[model samples]
Target chain A: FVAHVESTCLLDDAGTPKDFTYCISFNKDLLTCWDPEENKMAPCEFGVLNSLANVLSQHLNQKDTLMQRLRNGLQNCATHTQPFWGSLTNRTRPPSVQVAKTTPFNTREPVMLACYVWGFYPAEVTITWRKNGKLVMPHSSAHKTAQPNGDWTYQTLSHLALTPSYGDTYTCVVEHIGAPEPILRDWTPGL
Target chain B: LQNHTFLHTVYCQDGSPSVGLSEAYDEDQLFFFDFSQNTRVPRLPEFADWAQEQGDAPAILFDKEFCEWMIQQIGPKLDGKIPVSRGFPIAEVFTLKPLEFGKPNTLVCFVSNLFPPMLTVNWQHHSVPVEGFGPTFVSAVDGLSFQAFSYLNFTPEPSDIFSCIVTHEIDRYTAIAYWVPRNALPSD
Candidate 1:
């Protein structure tokens, strides 16, 4: 079992400290949570842990030192978070792009071109498909969506369906706040 | 058992903090103390008996306060040590069982090369969103990165198209993995 007991400080958009809370988890499942107002532990998980909660709260309720410190959580949060707020919020990561050709199941088109744009921070991004330097209608044959990379960066995939012909060119263009310029990755069909 | 493992973790989101203090025997979580609520939680209901005999909230409360104190004391010393890093997610979609039309199977979306341990995984069928997917399971790997897998209950159809979408919560960035029935249908 993996267990964690943590106290957290909350802040609003202006960096003003808000509610400070404490919580614990076991095996990634939340078991208990506490806030200064309640001044008691709230058992979670739908009564599965009610007995455990009741027994522990008895000991917890009697501790004046612990209770007072918890009451001061808001101040502690403000004091610590003020220094790192700007650096944490202002960080950004640039994106990388790749393109590949594949065949879809039972599709009329012989080839499907996929443009993968990934590893960029600040989720606001624009991905466009261009054929021979002209914009391709998104409504016609392109499917677009974005997913997170589990780090701080993001990713997206755009698909364009067509039967490739000689002398035709396709490009995947990406626009992100972190990129100084629109990033581009293109593909040309090969037999 | 002669050897056992104990783990204590403290993590925060914004200014809120959480804790995980656990004991494991042979890789199986046996018991844990929830510091926030000052309770002992057993991994299994059968172990509830063990909790009653060993429940001690005051000691665990000390751990919680001590953890808080350490953060205040050490958070600034390692200012740049916790540099924000990014990892490009790679996703693969596959079936848990062999492909057979009209039979129940599960689609698995596995994503790797994760950092900061956050992402959302969803399934889409025929360009429309699909729900009822299982909770994503995350685990640590080498290089201090993480990986996750989300399972979707599905059936194989020759014309069906399913895609797994992974959205990293931090950057709202996303990646996709597609799965198609590659096995030819048996002669009917």
Candidate 2:
């Protein structure tokens, strides 16, 4: 039987505390949460803990001290998080991009061209591929979603497949919030 | 300006409540609170003064008592209702540095959309489990979801195949992502 409780203060983009909520998790399942407006516990829309929530909320809503404490916690949120607002809200890291070709086991087979974009902050990114400096989709494409680097940075990969020609050039363009302009990396058929 | 985040997390394991409070500046963790000793531990000496601030002591103590009481009040009714929230995870594999044959690089396994934040990540070479990999890092993201990262250090070889296996512990669901090295043409 493992359980925990969380009181969080969500803030807006301007570094001002906007909302507060209380959450409870039992055996790693998030069961119920309460907001100041509701003043009562409600089960998560997802159904794992509804039964327990029904029973617990009945008892918890009657506790005046607990409700009062939550109100105080909401007040603490503003004071506790505001001092570090500038440091927490004003940092960014640029991305790195690389483009490469897959080695084909047979000389006549088509190979894959991979574009990797990594080490960027703020998560939202766009990756696109171009052939001969023209924006065209490849015959076969596999693009992956961006993922975090666990250090506030992110990475993703994109693939384009084609049989190469002597004068063919492929380029990978990545756009991110941290970079003022799109970052581009090019790959050719041969070294 | 350098950015930092602070965490004040309380845990209850087997009826014992504890706190894991830490201050992280950018990529580095600078200080942590040890509630058992009622002291702040700093990773560097420069942060000692901030850790020893008198204002934080009472707050830390209050959180411990709050966590203990909350768990005690809720734990008794939890039996037979231990249902878990499951979030299907998405995972991707990539190289930390550009892939060059015969050069050392790191493979990254990144997993996202984790609810409850309980998952295990493992690395495999050609479908066989490999050892000496680095520890997995789990961080909170928006909307009650979490993201995790796992790393493996290896030198790139022409025919090597590596895979990152992620298991969501709540429902025992598994997702695997793979990375393989290929080249275009010889530098010569």
Candidate 3:
């Protein structure tokens, strides 16, 4: 005797249904089914009806695991962290004070700067160049690479030919994960 | 029972007795093993020891005799030949997981056996030849077998179809299997 099993759909929170199907063939000793619309197949060994119960259990457990992590992060911030300051106080505070170096410069040659953050995770860093307190539009020639120990690093060259009248002050910004403010590093060329 | 045994022995030695012979004996000659009588001939084997030793062999002799009678009744029903088993190779399809669509995906194809392997595997994409990366040979997990694999890395788009062709020398046959990356997209 031969048996046939039909397909089913899984619904998301918004009630959007995902199409999925699984079919088994007794004579061939194999399961053959695919959702034409979705183009995704069931996970390995989950296509068989005999394994349906176990696979569904595992899928639910995975969902719970991700939810727990998100919940913990939210709870920690709400209970232990202070409220962020208003925009007025943030704007009134002065930026980090650093000495400007007076160095002879050429407009045609490449301008390079090394940005360093002593103790921070790599994902919490970003580097950018600015001219007269305004963010400069960087050229496509900029490249970035990560270090082995999860420390982030980047190098940018001044591809734009600048005039002596328009001085360039490139900045490197590093912000810790979930932090409200960033540590700033600034350099001026042809100053 | 004695009379039946005597009749069987005579019939086994000298074919079916003629009607004239039975007419002289004051009876019509019946070969006596007609279809209805043969149906009652005890489906079990004649000897108890043969039945015990053979362990309930599924009435092959009876089935063969029945088949012969059926062919005779139907007149050349079987094309003058008994059904025989022919050797045909089995083909199987295997797919790899985590197929990244619109990104480079690499596949390794190979065939393995218990001993020194003789099968070869080739890769094709939409009937066009492709260049393979690295060595195309692999030793089987058992360390006693060998296989050939073609490594392919290509950005699989919606229009591309990939195939793996396995050729076995002993069977002198080839089997082709295909996979399309577009088929791996998450369904809605």
- Worst lDDT run of 10 residues, candidate 3 chain A, spans A148-157
RMSD of 2: 6.2
Q: DockQ values for all predictions?
A: 0.06, 0.26, 0.01
Model 1 chain A lowest lDDT segment of ten:
A142-151
lDDT per residue, candidate 2, B1-188, as tens digits?
22233434444434222334444443334455666777867554545655665554655565456556555666665545555445788899877766777777788888888654667888899989997365676544334445677889998888899999888764458998988775522332
Candidate number 3, chain A TM-score = 0.31
Which segments of model 3 are wrong by more than 4 Å? A1-191, B1-97, B114-116, B141-148, B169-171, B182-188
Relative to the real complex, the DockQ score for model 3 comes to: 0.01
Rank ordering of all candidates by DockQ, starting from the highest: 2, 1, 3
How are the candidates ranked when ordered by TM-score, highest leading?
2, 1, 3
Tens digits of per-residue lDDT for model 3, B18-119: 100000000101111223222212111221222122211232233233223322442243233323212222333222223346656565454434122335
> Taking the tens digit of each residue's C-alpha lDDT, what string does model 1 give over B29-118?
335555556565655465565555433355455755544543454335434543434567888986654456888877778788864456
Model 3, global lDDT: 0.33
- Per-residue lDDT of A129 in model 3: 48
Our model 3 lands, by Cα RMSD against the true structure, at 31.9
What C-alpha root-mean-square deviation, in Å, does candidate 1 show against the real structure? 17.4
**How many residue pairs clash per model?**
30, 0, 1
The TM-scores that each candidate's chain B achieves against the reference are 0.63, 0.66, 0.40
Per-residue lDDT value at B131 in model 3: 66
C-alpha lDDT values of all predictions? 0.59, 0.65, 0.33
Better of 2 and 3 by DockQ: 2
